[PDB]
Amino acid sequence: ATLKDIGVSAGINILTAFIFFIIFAFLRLQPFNDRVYFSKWYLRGLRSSPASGGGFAGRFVNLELRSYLKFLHWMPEALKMPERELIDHAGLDSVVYLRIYWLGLKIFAPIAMLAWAVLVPVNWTNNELELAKHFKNVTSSDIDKLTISNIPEGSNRFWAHIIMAYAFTIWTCYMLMKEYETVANMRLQFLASEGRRPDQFTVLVRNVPPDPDETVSELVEHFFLVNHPDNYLTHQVVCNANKLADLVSKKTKLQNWLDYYQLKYTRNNSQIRPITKLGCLGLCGQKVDAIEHYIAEVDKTSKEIAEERENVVNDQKSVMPASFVSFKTRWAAAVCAQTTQTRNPTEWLTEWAAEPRDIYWPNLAIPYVSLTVRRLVMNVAFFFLTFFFIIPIAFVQSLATIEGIEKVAPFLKVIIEKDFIKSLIQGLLAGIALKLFLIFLPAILMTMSKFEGFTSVSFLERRSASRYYIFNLVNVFLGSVIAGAAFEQLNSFLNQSPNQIPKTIGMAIPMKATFFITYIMVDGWAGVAGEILMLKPLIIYHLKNAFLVKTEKDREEAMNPGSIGFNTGEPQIQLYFLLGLVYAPVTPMLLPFILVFFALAYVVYRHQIINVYNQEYESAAAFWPDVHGRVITALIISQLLLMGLLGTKHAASAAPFLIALPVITIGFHRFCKGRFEPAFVRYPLQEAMMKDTLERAREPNLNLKGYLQDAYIHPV
Amino acid sequence: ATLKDIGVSAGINILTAFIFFIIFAFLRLQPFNDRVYFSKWYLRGLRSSPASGGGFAGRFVNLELRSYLKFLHWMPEALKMPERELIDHAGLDSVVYLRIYWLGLKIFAPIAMLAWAVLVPVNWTNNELELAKHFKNVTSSDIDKLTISNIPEGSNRFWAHIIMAYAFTIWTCYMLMKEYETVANMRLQFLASEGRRPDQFTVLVRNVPPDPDETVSELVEHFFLVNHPDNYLTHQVVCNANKLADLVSKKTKLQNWLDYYQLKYTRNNSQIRPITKLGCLGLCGQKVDAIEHYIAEVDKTSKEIAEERENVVNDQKSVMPASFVSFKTRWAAAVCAQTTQTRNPTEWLTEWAAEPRDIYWPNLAIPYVSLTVRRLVMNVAFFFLTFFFIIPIAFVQSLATIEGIEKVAPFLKVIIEKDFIKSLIQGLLAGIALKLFLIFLPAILMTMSKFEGFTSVSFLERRSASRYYIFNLVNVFLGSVIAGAAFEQLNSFLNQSPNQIPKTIGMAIPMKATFFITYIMVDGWAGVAGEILMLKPLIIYHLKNAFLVKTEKDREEAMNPGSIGFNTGEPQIQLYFLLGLVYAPVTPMLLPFILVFFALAYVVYRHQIINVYNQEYESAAAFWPDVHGRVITALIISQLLLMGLLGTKHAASAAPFLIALPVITIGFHRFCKGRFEPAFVRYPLQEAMMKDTLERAREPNLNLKGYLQDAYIHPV
Ligand SMILES: CCCCCCCCCCCCCC(=O)OC[C@@H](O)COP(=O)(O)OCC[N+](C)(C)C
Ligand SMILES: CCCCCCCCCCCCCC(=O)OC[C@@H](O)COP(=O)(O)OCC[N+](C)(C)C
């Protein structure tokens, strides 16, 4: 895995990224895409059509004379928009995400320089890995002599590792507190200048207590007109368009899926009959005939739709025990969100409402007790997923440590591991397998967050990211560590005795570092570079437009871009931060790769937040408190592991120092928490009065009951 | 320590309590005390003077013909006032304290019956304590064969212990949740009917941010008139009047002191000259001469006392960055206490104010940063006190395990521990020594709570009780356990080998139980019975009245009773609950003694809450959340210790069951918490509006700015 495998992976990966960048140039210079690659410039009313208004080309005939402007330009230009002109083109959230990448860089760049110098020198001048291969059968290479494991048991050269660790934790923590403050100040300034949104005045009251002679709405009016007497303006109840909406949706699906097999070439048409109960399928069946999904799955749907409408809207059997109450001021609404209203701690429970567009309406109609049982069931499913994944994870770790599995088992083999280009290619293949598994993980975890019952689309994402973190941690990190350890040094474990289990464990942790390096390379580099091409979103449009088009004009738009994830992306940045801290005080060579990822990523994503991407909710940066927490967790795990390894190499004249480390970390956490979290979780009342008195001097007229009344209704 | 020592202690203690009760009868039938023994009947305007209006006797001449009405009566009668006529004679707090004693009884009575039956039988039919004295030198008696230690290693009779443990934890937890609800409902109903107090409308704002052109009061008016615009009525600033307060104090001391040395017999008088720098003293010195602290001292103090009044009432150098703001409604004030006011999380910080009489004004004039450093310094002092106490604690535990210290050291000895009445008397003496040390502890801990900076006299008490708990736990319990263990089985530890350290530890835990029994007896029984006599408060009055009297009439009153403590008392109840749980699943014989304490105590204290005692603040039961927590802690420690002992006797076919136990305990804690703590820590807004709308219909006129303006001023 020495320089050979690292170089092969690196060559292949840099090549993949350059090929990507070339195909992207090509595809972004053809004027039939355009609305796929420059969509927030069109969805902001600022770009018109193909060739500056369209009607023209720029396609393939000469297409492109050679260019070094095949890259670079996108690069520098993404770099040049001030960061305050980006808060208003894009939003605060996007800007705070790019900030995460830059904090990474900060921390790590300094740590890397230092590490390298001090520690590589120390570790390299020191002999104890050649002696264990010759007297204890521990397999190793020459990339392993810049690690904490070429160092003899018996210190005096372990103190470097401890001092460096201290330096590193202090730097990380300082940098992290400075970012907390910036992000807080920014949030507050944004919040003070954003224009009316309907949720700066509304709350969601959940658990209105039942009665037998008053409706839900005659009980919500009477409570707030007696208890919040001067500022109360209106309310809107919660009902079940769950079924009504399901039918409107089936109708849309039928019409799409059949105005297709309707204007196929015009005229009378064909047939199909897929088995329809799970997914995919086609022609395996009996539902022949034709057009409009027999225009009549078309019209039966429409009739059920009208009847459902009726029942719902006329029945107080479909009103849920909850409402959305609005007030005349933003000061009054912030007092109903942070105050207790009744003596029963579970009834009448106010919070702040989300913006009417970050509401997942399908879970506003789920009872409250169910909420608790559901949460439990989902925690159980999580534990089981964690176990099945351990299975696929070791499968991967057996392809990566194959040259040691083929020593205590000189059996099947890649022609007995000769033909050495093949084994480096095996390091690359291990990477690709883990990639695959982890894709479907993101989607499953979102489905499990939408069951436990949340009702904002921004909290479902935050939850999903937290769960990915846990999964990632355990599984990837530790599973890989454990299994890889097993295999190579399994060879060594058989032909020795059960004490050497520990020492062998220490050295194997540093080798798993080397595998992590390769994975970073694949994932990081190539993925950030292949994200620039938007390929599912490009096929998707072109198929769409030469199939289900029949556009009235061009007003029929199906370009919709997407949004950063929060989910996928944050989970990745965090895995890489963990890796980095841990390996900084052990193998100081994962750092250069971590850094290339952070920089490319910042450049690609600024481009995609500026040209493509559009945000679907605005919660001025709350995930910050969450991100900070996850970095503090990494720091603690790192520190505990260094203690462990230092114990395995018998150095007791240094581990209490490592203990002070952990305590200093938790103390800084607590400080930060205090100050800045207050900023992110509680709306001051002086801030709500200043926004409110400056808008009643500018718009001295304003009727708020027009605007706020119907903003929280549904598909009605 | 068998039946012999237990019986001697019990006889002597029951005798002491009966002698006490007799002397109390005597002293409560003489009509010169009366105002010492029936003071809340005089301080409520309901009793007049000595013999029904006084002027008469009932003293010593025939004094008392023999009576069996020498006791009993106080007993039944304390029992007969409904518990709702006691909420208004006395207050809610006192009633909730007596409830603690009754919960004790509940839990333990059931647990005791069960224990006894099942476990004593099981443990007694079983041989393994006679075999270890004959083959491992473990000293023991015959009271030890009803303990978990006459049971052979190897279970099948340890399962009883585990089942019983489960039963016991469930019962405790059920009982505890039912009390939570009662106490919560009671608090809420009280709070809804109590008449105006000035703090139902006021808050304390601490940390008003400095300026260079506006005073503290022109900055508190402007903030609340712009930010809480409609309900704001008044404010009163905080000034350091620590020095004037101190000189008024020195003046009263001088006059009292020496209007005494003045009317000694009238005329020209004597002299004195104590060393005056630390305390006590008399005649060792030079300050001779004459009457009322050389009346010139009394006037030089009244010079400073009028020129301190000027440099304090007109300066703005003695105004502290804080105020007390009042509002026109109780709904408005509860919104300022539970809401954030500014973006700087450390400035402008509102809470609810205490009643103007539960304010410790001396610490309202301490800066805020100091508050944090002070807290740290006091935590350090706590750790050191804990260590010195370990020293006196083992001294005590060496007098209690003397018959085993005099085996591996047949030396000095009580005439070689013969004369056996003497060694039982040593069990009683150990008890008395611990009593002594622990007295001065209560007072020290209060002094340390008044340094860390609190400003209510009710929180200083709560803090002091929590600290006593920790001290008690560690020191008493564990120190005693450890040291006692050491001594007896030290004998056994020398003449064996360092593996038998563990097994010997198990058996010694059960013997320390027996010593705890004796301490309970002394402390509990005799102390509750000697508390009925109020002897420092009786001497104190009689000296006072035949010395510093010269009463204008009788209006000069110096009877002041006191108040329950909260401090001392709660700390005791909790030590006994701990002991009980722990020993219930091990030595099932501490329980009968625990119970006698709980019952006597309830009877004596009801008497003293009904006749003597008067409350100095009213915080309708908040210490409840605190008490509950401490009982949950006991449950957890108990459970962990049973696991330990069961491990020491090699029973692995039962300890995971013990683990489930701990988790079930924390779950019930969390439920309770949720519901009822909300009740005790947050004032609902529907409750404040109902109190406010029913008082504006009864007293339709009411000016609140008269009443609320000057309630928060000082010695001015
Ligand atoms: C993630 C870690 C969390 C907390 C970290 C502390 C846990 C680890 C601390 C100790 C780890 C290893 C402890 C250690 O001491 O290992 C046991 C060694 O002493 C065993 O040495 P041996 O080679 O068996 O010595 C005997 C050799 N003959 C066999 C005596 C030659
Ligand atoms: C407060 C407790 C917190 C948690 C509770 C768990 C901690 C205690 C759990 C184990 C306690 C004792 C554990 C135990 O296993 O003791 C060690 C014994 O196995 C020693 O047995 P020995 O008599 O040394 O056996 C060897 C005998 N020769 C010497 C082999 C005869």
Coordinates of N, CA and C in Angstrom, one line a residue, chain B residues 64-169:
Chain B
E64 N -47.5 19.6 90.2 CA -48.3 18.5 89.6 C -48.6 17.2 90.4
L65 N -49.8 16.9 90.7 CA -50.2 15.6 91.3 C -49.9 14.6 90.2
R66 N -49.5 13.4 90.5 CA -49.1 12.5 89.4 C -50.0 12.4 88.3
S67 N -49.5 12.2 87.0 CA -50.3 12.1 85.9 C -49.9 11.2 84.8
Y68 N -50.8 10.5 84.1 CA -50.5 9.7 82.9 C -50.8 10.6 81.8
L69 N -51.3 11.8 82.2 CA -51.6 12.8 81.3 C -50.2 13.5 81.4
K70 N -49.2 12.8 81.1 CA -47.9 13.3 81.2 C -47.3 13.2 79.9
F71 N -48.1 13.0 79.0 CA -47.5 12.6 77.7 C -48.5 12.6 76.8
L72 N -49.2 11.5 76.9 CA -50.2 11.2 75.9 C -51.0 12.3 75.4
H73 N -51.2 13.2 76.2 CA -52.1 14.2 75.7 C -51.5 15.0 74.6
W74 N -50.4 15.6 74.8 CA -49.7 16.3 73.8 C -49.9 15.4 72.6
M75 N -49.5 14.1 72.7 CA -49.6 13.2 71.6 C -51.0 13.2 70.8
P76 N -52.0 12.6 71.4 CA -53.3 12.7 70.6 C -53.8 14.1 70.1
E77 N -53.5 15.1 70.8 CA -54.0 16.4 70.4 C -53.3 17.0 69.2
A78 N -51.9 16.7 69.2 CA -51.2 17.2 68.0 C -51.7 16.5 66.9
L79 N -52.0 15.2 67.1 CA -52.7 14.5 66.0 C -54.0 15.1 65.5
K80 N -55.0 15.6 66.3 CA -56.3 16.1 65.8 C -56.8 17.5 65.0
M81 N -56.1 18.3 64.3 CA -56.3 19.5 63.5 C -56.3 19.0 62.2
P82 N -57.3 19.3 61.4 CA -57.3 18.8 60.0 C -56.1 19.3 59.3
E83 N -55.7 18.8 58.1 CA -54.6 19.3 57.5 C -54.8 20.5 56.6
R84 N -56.0 21.1 56.7 CA -56.3 22.3 55.9 C -56.5 23.4 56.8
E85 N -56.3 23.2 58.1 CA -56.6 24.3 59.0 C -55.2 24.4 59.5
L86 N -54.3 23.5 59.1 CA -52.9 23.6 59.4 C -52.3 24.4 58.3
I87 N -52.7 24.3 57.0 CA -52.1 25.1 56.0 C -52.3 26.6 56.3
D88 N -53.4 27.0 56.9 CA -53.5 28.4 57.3 C -53.1 28.9 58.6
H89 N -52.8 28.0 59.6 CA -52.3 28.4 60.9 C -50.9 28.5 60.6
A90 N -50.3 27.5 60.0 CA -48.9 27.4 59.7 C -48.4 27.8 58.3
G91 N -48.8 27.2 57.3 CA -48.3 27.4 55.9 C -48.2 26.2 55.2
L92 N -47.9 26.2 53.9 CA -47.7 25.0 53.1 C -46.4 24.3 53.3
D93 N -45.3 25.0 53.4 CA -44.1 24.3 53.6 C -44.1 23.3 54.8
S94 N -44.6 23.7 55.9 CA -44.6 22.9 57.1 C -45.4 21.7 56.9
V95 N -46.6 21.8 56.4 CA -47.4 20.7 56.0 C -46.7 19.7 55.0
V96 N -46.1 20.2 54.0 CA -45.3 19.3 53.1 C -44.0 18.6 53.8
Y97 N -43.4 19.2 54.8 CA -42.4 18.5 55.6 C -43.0 17.3 56.4
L98 N -44.1 17.6 57.0 CA -44.6 16.5 57.8 C -45.0 15.4 56.8
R99 N -45.4 15.7 55.6 CA -45.6 14.7 54.6 C -44.4 13.9 54.3
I100 N -43.3 14.4 54.1 CA -42.0 13.6 54.0 C -42.0 12.5 55.1
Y101 N -42.1 12.9 56.3 CA -42.2 11.8 57.3 C -43.2 10.7 57.1
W102 N -44.4 11.1 56.9 CA -45.4 10.0 56.4 C -45.1 9.2 55.1
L103 N -44.5 9.7 54.1 CA -44.1 8.9 52.9 C -43.1 7.9 53.4
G104 N -42.1 8.4 54.2 CA -41.2 7.4 54.8 C -42.0 6.2 55.3
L105 N -42.9 6.5 56.2 CA -43.6 5.4 56.8 C -44.1 4.6 55.8
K106 N -45.0 5.1 55.0 CA -45.5 4.2 53.9 C -44.6 3.2 53.2
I107 N -43.6 3.8 52.5 CA -42.6 2.9 51.9 C -42.1 1.8 52.8
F108 N -41.5 2.3 53.9 CA -40.9 1.3 54.8 C -41.8 0.3 55.5
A109 N -43.0 0.6 55.8 CA -43.7 -0.3 56.5 C -44.0 -1.4 55.6
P110 N -44.6 -1.1 54.4 CA -44.7 -2.3 53.6 C -43.4 -3.2 53.4
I111 N -42.3 -2.5 53.0 CA -41.1 -3.2 52.8 C -40.7 -4.1 53.9
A112 N -40.7 -3.6 55.1 CA -40.4 -4.3 56.3 C -41.2 -5.5 56.5
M113 N -42.5 -5.4 56.5 CA -43.1 -6.7 56.7 C -42.6 -7.7 55.7
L114 N -42.6 -7.4 54.4 CA -42.3 -8.4 53.5 C -40.9 -9.0 53.8
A115 N -39.9 -8.1 53.9 CA -38.6 -8.5 54.1 C -38.6 -9.4 55.1
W116 N -38.9 -9.0 56.3 CA -38.9 -9.9 57.4 C -39.3 -11.1 57.1
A117 N -40.6 -11.3 56.9 CA -40.9 -12.7 56.6 C -40.0 -13.5 55.6
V118 N -40.1 -13.2 54.3 CA -39.3 -14.0 53.4 C -37.8 -14.1 53.8
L119 N -37.2 -13.0 53.9 CA -35.8 -13.0 54.0 C -35.2 -13.5 55.3
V120 N -35.9 -13.2 56.4 CA -35.3 -13.7 57.6 C -35.4 -15.2 57.5
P121 N -36.6 -15.7 57.3 CA -36.5 -17.2 57.2 C -35.4 -17.8 56.2
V122 N -35.4 -17.3 55.0 CA -34.3 -17.8 54.1 C -33.0 -17.7 54.7
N123 N -32.5 -16.5 55.0 CA -31.2 -16.3 55.6 C -30.8 -17.1 56.7
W124 N -31.7 -17.3 57.7 CA -31.4 -18.0 58.9 C -31.2 -19.4 58.7
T125 N -32.0 -20.1 57.9 CA -31.7 -21.6 57.7 C -30.5 -21.9 56.8
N126 N -29.2 -21.7 57.2 CA -28.2 -21.7 56.2 C -26.7 -21.7 56.5
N127 N -26.2 -22.0 57.7 CA -24.7 -22.3 58.1 C -23.4 -21.6 57.7
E128 N -23.2 -20.8 56.7 CA -21.9 -20.2 56.3 C -21.3 -19.1 57.0
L129 N -21.6 -18.9 58.2 CA -20.8 -17.8 58.9 C -20.1 -18.6 60.0
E130 N -20.5 -19.7 60.4 CA -19.8 -20.5 61.4 C -18.6 -21.2 60.8
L131 N -18.6 -21.4 59.5 CA -17.6 -22.1 58.8 C -16.5 -21.2 58.5
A132 N -16.8 -19.9 58.3 CA -15.7 -19.0 58.1 C -15.0 -18.4 59.3
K133 N -15.6 -18.6 60.4 CA -14.9 -18.2 61.6 C -14.0 -19.3 62.0
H134 N -14.3 -20.5 61.5 CA -13.5 -21.7 61.8 C -12.5 -22.0 60.7
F135 N -12.5 -21.3 59.6 CA -11.6 -21.6 58.5 C -11.2 -20.4 57.7
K136 N -11.2 -19.2 58.3 CA -10.9 -17.9 57.6 C -10.9 -16.8 58.5
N137 N -11.1 -17.1 59.8 CA -11.1 -16.0 60.8 C -12.0 -14.8 60.7
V138 N -13.2 -14.9 60.2 CA -14.1 -13.8 60.1 C -14.9 -13.7 61.3
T139 N -14.8 -12.7 62.1 CA -15.5 -12.5 63.4 C -17.0 -12.2 63.1
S140 N -17.9 -12.6 64.0 CA -19.3 -12.5 63.8 C -20.0 -12.8 65.0
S141 N -21.4 -12.7 65.0 CA -22.2 -12.9 66.2 C -23.3 -13.8 65.8
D142 N -24.5 -13.6 66.5 CA -25.7 -14.4 66.2 C -26.8 -13.5 65.6
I143 N -26.5 -12.2 65.5 CA -27.4 -11.3 64.9 C -27.1 -11.3 63.5
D144 N -26.0 -12.0 63.1 CA -25.6 -11.9 61.8 C -26.1 -13.1 61.0
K145 N -26.9 -13.9 61.6 CA -27.4 -14.9 60.9 C -28.8 -14.6 60.4
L146 N -29.2 -13.4 60.2 CA -30.5 -13.1 59.7 C -30.1 -12.1 58.6
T147 N -28.8 -12.0 58.4 CA -28.3 -11.2 57.3 C -27.9 -11.9 55.9
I148 N -27.6 -11.3 54.8 CA -27.2 -11.9 53.6 C -26.0 -12.6 53.6
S149 N -25.4 -12.7 54.8 CA -24.1 -13.3 54.9 C -24.0 -14.6 55.7
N150 N -25.1 -15.3 56.0 CA -25.1 -16.6 56.6 C -25.5 -17.4 55.4
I151 N -25.4 -16.8 54.2 CA -25.9 -17.6 53.1 C -24.7 -18.1 52.3
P152 N -24.6 -19.4 51.9 CA -23.5 -19.9 51.2 C -23.2 -19.4 49.8
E153 N -22.0 -19.4 49.4 CA -21.7 -18.9 48.1 C -22.3 -19.9 47.3
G154 N -22.9 -19.5 46.2 CA -23.7 -20.5 45.5 C -25.2 -20.3 45.8
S155 N -25.9 -19.7 44.9 CA -27.2 -19.3 45.1 C -28.4 -20.2 45.4
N156 N -29.4 -20.0 44.6 CA -30.6 -20.7 44.8 C -31.3 -20.3 46.0
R157 N -30.8 -19.2 46.6 CA -31.4 -18.7 47.8 C -31.0 -17.3 47.7
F158 N -30.6 -16.8 46.6 CA -30.2 -15.4 46.4 C -31.3 -14.8 45.5
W159 N -32.1 -15.7 45.0 CA -33.1 -15.2 44.1 C -34.1 -14.6 44.9
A160 N -34.3 -15.0 46.2 CA -35.2 -14.3 47.0 C -34.8 -12.9 47.1
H161 N -33.6 -12.6 47.5 CA -33.0 -11.3 47.6 C -33.3 -10.5 46.3
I162 N -33.0 -11.0 45.1 CA -33.4 -10.3 43.9 C -34.9 -10.0 43.7
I163 N -35.8 -10.9 43.8 CA -37.2 -10.6 43.7 C -37.6 -9.6 44.7
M164 N -37.1 -9.6 45.9 CA -37.5 -8.7 46.9 C -37.0 -7.4 46.5
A165 N -35.8 -7.2 46.1 CA -35.4 -6.0 45.6 C -36.2 -5.4 44.6
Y166 N -36.6 -6.1 43.5 CA -37.6 -5.6 42.6 C -38.8 -5.1 43.2
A167 N -39.5 -5.9 43.9 CA -40.7 -5.4 44.7 C -40.4 -4.1 45.4
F168 N -39.4 -4.0 46.2 CA -39.1 -2.9 46.9 C -38.9 -1.7 46.1
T169 N -38.1 -1.7 45.0 CA -38.0 -0.5 44.1 C -39.3 -0.1 43.5

